[PDB]
Amino acid sequence: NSIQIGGLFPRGADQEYSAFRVGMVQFSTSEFRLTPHIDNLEVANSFAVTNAFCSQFSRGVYAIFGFYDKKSVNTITSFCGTLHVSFITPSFPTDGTHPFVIQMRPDLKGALLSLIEYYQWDKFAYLYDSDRGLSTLQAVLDSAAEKKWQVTAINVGNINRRVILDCERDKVNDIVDQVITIGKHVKGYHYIIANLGFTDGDLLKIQFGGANVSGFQIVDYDDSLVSKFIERWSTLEEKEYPGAHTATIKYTSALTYDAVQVMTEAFRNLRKQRIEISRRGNAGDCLANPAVPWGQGVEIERALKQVQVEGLSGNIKFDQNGKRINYTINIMELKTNGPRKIGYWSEVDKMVVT
Amino acid sequence: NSIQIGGLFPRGADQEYSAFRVGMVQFSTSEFRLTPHIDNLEVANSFAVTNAFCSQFSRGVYAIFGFYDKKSVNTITSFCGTLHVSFITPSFPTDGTHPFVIQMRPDLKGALLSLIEYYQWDKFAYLYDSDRGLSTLQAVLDSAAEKKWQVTAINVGNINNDKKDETYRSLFQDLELKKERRVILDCERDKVNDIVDQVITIGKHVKGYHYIIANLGFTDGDLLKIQFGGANVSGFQIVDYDDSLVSKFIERWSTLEEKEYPGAHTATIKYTSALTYDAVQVMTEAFRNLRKQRIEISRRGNAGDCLANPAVPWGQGVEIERALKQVQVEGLSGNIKFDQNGKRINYTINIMELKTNGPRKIGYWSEVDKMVVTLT
Ligand SMILES: *[C@@H]1O[C@H](CO)[C@@H](O[C@@H]2O[C@H](CO)[C@@H](O[C@@H]3O[C@H](CO)[C@@H](O)[C@H](O)[C@@H]3O)[C@H](O)[C@H]2NC(C)=O)[C@H](O)[C@H]1NC(C)=O
Numbered sequence: 005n006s007i008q009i010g011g012l013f014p015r016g017a018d019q020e021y022s023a024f025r026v027g028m029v030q031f032s033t034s035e036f037r038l039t040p041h042i043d044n045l046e047v048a049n050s051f052a053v054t055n056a057f058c059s060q061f062s063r064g065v066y067a068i069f070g071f072y073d074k075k076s077v078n079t080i081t082s083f084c085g086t087l088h089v090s091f092i093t094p095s096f097p098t099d100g101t102h103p104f105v106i107q108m109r110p111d112l113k114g115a116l117l118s119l120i121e122y123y124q125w126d127k128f129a130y131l132y133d134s135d136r137g138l139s140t141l142q143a144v145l146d147s148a149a150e151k152k153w154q155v156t157a158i159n160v161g162n163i164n165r166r167v168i169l170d171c172e173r174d175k176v177n178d179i180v181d182q183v184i185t186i187g188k189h190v191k192g193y194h195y196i197i198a199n200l201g202f203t204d205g206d207l208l209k210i211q212f213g214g215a216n217v218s219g220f221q222i223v224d225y226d227d228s229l230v231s232k233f234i235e236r237w238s239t240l241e242e243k244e245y246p247g248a249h250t251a252t253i254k255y256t257s258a259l260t261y262d263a264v265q266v267m268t269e270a271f272r273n274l275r276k277q278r279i280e281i282s283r284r285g286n287a288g289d290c291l292a293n294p295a296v297p298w299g300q301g302v303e304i305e306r307a308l309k310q311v312q313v314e315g316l317s318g319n320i321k322f323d324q325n326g327k328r329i330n331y332t333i334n335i336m337e338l339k340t341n342g343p344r345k346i347g348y349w350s351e352v353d354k355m356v357v358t
Numbered sequence: 359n360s361i362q363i364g365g366l367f368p369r370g371a372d373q374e375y376s377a378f379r380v381g382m383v384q385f386s387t388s389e390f391r392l393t394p395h396i397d398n399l400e401v402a403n404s405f406a407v408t409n410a411f412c413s414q415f416s417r418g419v420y421a422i423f424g425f426y427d428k429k430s431v432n433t434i435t436s437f438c439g440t441l442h443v444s445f446i447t448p449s450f451p452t453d454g455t456h457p458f459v460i461q462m463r464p465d466l467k468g469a470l471l472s473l474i475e476y477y478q479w480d481k482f483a484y485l486y487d488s489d490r491g492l493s494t495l496q497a498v499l500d501s502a503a504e505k506k507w508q509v510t511a512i513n514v515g516n517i518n519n520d521k522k523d524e525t526y527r528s529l530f531q532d533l534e535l536k537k538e539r540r541v542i543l544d545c546e547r548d549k550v551n552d553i554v555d556q557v558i559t560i561g562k563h564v565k566g567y568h569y570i571i572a573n574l575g576f577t578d579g580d581l582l583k584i585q586f587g588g589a590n591v592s593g594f595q596i597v598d599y600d601d602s603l604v605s606k607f608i609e610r611w612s613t614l615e616e617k618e619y620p621g622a623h624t625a626t627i628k629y630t631s632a633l634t635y636d637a638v639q640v641m642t643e644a645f646r647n648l649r650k651q652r653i654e655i656s657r658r659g660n661a662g663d664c665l666a667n668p669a670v671p672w673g674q675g676v677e678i679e680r681a682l683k684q685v686q687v688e689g690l691s692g693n694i695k696f697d698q699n700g701k702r703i704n705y706t707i708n709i710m711e712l713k714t715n716g717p718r719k720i721g722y723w724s725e726v727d728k729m730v731v732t733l734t
Pocket residue numbers: 312313319320321330331332350
């Protein structure tokens with residue numbers, strides 16, 4: 005039979021939607037068909053997000069794949085928790101209690117703290133914006149006081165030589181451009197770029213003026229799964245799949261493809277347990293208070309969190325709060341030849357060289 | 359005539375509701391009154407906040423008075439901006455700009471930064487609560503490089519959490535190992551003594567500490583030097599009990615029966631309750647001149663109308679928004695005036711210290727000048 009799911013995409017997230025579509029084809033099975041209902045909206049607009057969520061809810065969707073941002077994350081978490089509708093997302097993870105949110109993106113805070121320690125930094129700047137949450141800010145401040153670090157933590161998000169940049173890609177360019185412009189000790193700087201897409205396109209087109217640059221990567225192109233994927237992705241018709249026909253894939257797009265794998269696996273597992281996922285009967289007003297307890301929702305959430313598969317972002321496994329666990333983050337440096345992996349980080353071993 | 363308004367109150371805002379009711383009596387006249395419809399909600403729950411806001415929208419109110427927190431502020435700003443219904447609030451003011459929001463609460467960050475400079479601090483602990491918000495901490499961290507401040511930031515919002523032992527370890531390392539004696543407390547006003555009590559059991563030579571209470575209600579709770587272990591204590595106050603307007607209010611408020619008016623029968627009023635009373639004055643002054651629309655029937659609201667009904671035409675809603683922002687009155691929180699984004703301007707924050715005889719005003723911070731001025 006067909007299983008209804010929702011898709012909540014930001015306007016302009018073209019590559020991610022192409023990755024979603026490619027995943028829908030790749031992970032298709034004879035057992036059931038995933039029938040997606042797509043909405044494109046401004047995810048920063050909580051009213052619009054509410055409208056889209058309610059639309060999906062009323063179509064009886066069994067799960068929603070989508071994105072949020074700092075302004076709408078609370079709408080998503082509260083509506084998911086209230087209605088027992090699972091939201092699977094490549095957006096920034098959160099540390100709070102968020103039943104019914106499955107976060108495809110691994111937490112970077114631990115790898116970042118381990119890297120600062122690996123380079124033996126004790127004095128540095130953390131230049132950040134709030135677009136990916138403030139948990140990383142809090143974690144840096146916590147560790148600073150513990151290890152006697154002197155940290156200069158500046159919010160660059162509202163603006164009209166060891167440096168961590170945890171900000172929008174546009175701002176990285178502006179900041180580095182400024183350092184090279186000043187012309188003082190340009191090569192003596194060391195930037196750590198606090199995101200999971202070191203080699204994703206744009207970042208390494210920046211002229212760093214010979215400074216040291218380090219970062220992180222969750223998609224390992226040496227992986228058999230990934231190289232095989234890229235072999236096909238790199239030859240797709242860009243007209244048909246905007247953002248495709250590239251040698252690399254943004255990590256958010258890779259997580260979107262992986263999310264389709266996770267959803268498919270969850271529904272396969274529910275089918276194996278004879279848990280009904282065919283079609284919801286009558287869904288009342290979305291904004292009914294109190295909300296009606298939808299029973300299947302709890303099992304669907306459990307099944308999504310129970311999934312274990314290997315994808316483009318490596319080993320995928322979740323804890324009871326929908327957070328990635330048992331993952332690995334590759335630590336990268338920009339060498340004179342190009343970006344190179346210098347080691348990796350996992351929960352159990354922290355940072356391991358080579 | 360009468361104008362219908364919404365009132366959205368969090369659980370535990372008992373005194374604020376009493377102040378709202380007292381305001382409705384004070385500012386009503388035989389010629390004009392507000393007719394409120396009160397909903398009581400979990401402000402931390404965005405789904406519940408959405409339901410409440412939308413039900414008021416459905417009923418057809420001129421404005422909604424209410425509260426939000428860190429988790430629900432985006433619901434309020436997005437809904438009032440989309441539906442074009444004005445929301446007037448004593449909650450923490452938002453860092454950015456958002457139409458259809460009237461912020462009764464003056465910004466605190468400016469006065470706090472100025473007070474740190476005034477005392478010539480160069481090193482201090484900043485005890486914050488992440489569930490409360492980090493905007494003020496961020497302002498302090500942003501200024502720390504330029505001002506040469508060594509800040510040790512500790513989330514005491516985790517003092518009872520799973521991060522509890524981590525929180526105590528942090529307090530211990532700063533107070534015992536690093537001998538920190540300057541402490542900023544950025545927290546709920548009624549949590550000050552609980553946090554201080556913990557600090558006192560952890561630190562040493564506590565009589566020598568200097569706390570700044572980063573909150574607009576310095577005297578909202580008991581201030582007993584003995585409770586502070588003999589330390590210096592500084593803070594901020596927007597309700598000035600020397601003001602005739604305020605002392606007259608308190609003369610009346612102090613005899614209201616406490617069962618009937620929870621939180622009243624006191625010699626002080628919480629700054630949030632004062633702002634709630636002032637909000638009734640602002641709405642009254644804004645609305646008394648607006649068009650007397652044809653007397654219609656008021657009916658229970660349906661939250662689903664947020665999706666079923668169109669937004670209030672912008673040209674209609676903006677007239678109410680502008681009327682609110684144009685109000686200039688004196689209230690319990692002093693001079694009330696708004697900029698084009700609904701932020702308080704031209705306000706004054708009193709700077710207080712706990713002295714021998716009790717809390718005393720030692721100076722003030724005006725929004726126009728943005729420095730601490732010392733009083734004789
Ligand atoms: C949880 O995480 C770890 C990755 O840290 C996964 O364990 C690893 O699994 C891979 C297979 O995907 C192992 O690599 C293989 O090793 C053998 C011999 O050691 C080699 O000849 C093969 O060609 C291949 O490279 C890796 O050794 C292993 N690592 C550890 C530390 O055990 C595990 O599968 C993940 N489990 C789940 C449920 O996600």
